[PDB]
């Protein structure tokens, strides 16, 4: 009689576990910054060794 | 009868000199680009040997 959701994105490994049950009001997410878009024209992808990629 | 204009700047070495007197009208300063101010969101900071730095 309670809510199931089978997780089916790919992150769940059946080796660690097969079920969870919880309290979810208890599970707190924090959003600081909502999903942001930037689109840059100038500039550089770099290496972390600072060589150049794509400019 | 002259003011007494101290220099309250870090700028005096009073290990140099205690009280410099001029000819005040023999000295001139050239502004070329007054003071400018830029902002940038791409780019690059990069080293003397053309590795980046910051990106």
Do not use: H, M, Y
Not at 13 to 24: P, R, V
Not at 38 to 50: P, T
Request: aromatic share 10%.
């Amino acid at each position: 009689g309670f809510p199931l959701n089978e997780v089916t994105s790919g992150v769940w490994d059946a080796d660690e576990a097969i079920l969870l049950g919880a309290d979810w009001s208890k599970v707190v997410i924090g959003i600081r910054q909502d999903i942001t878009f930037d689109l840059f024209s100038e500039g550089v992808i770099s290496d972390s060794d600072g060589k150049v990629v794509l400019n």
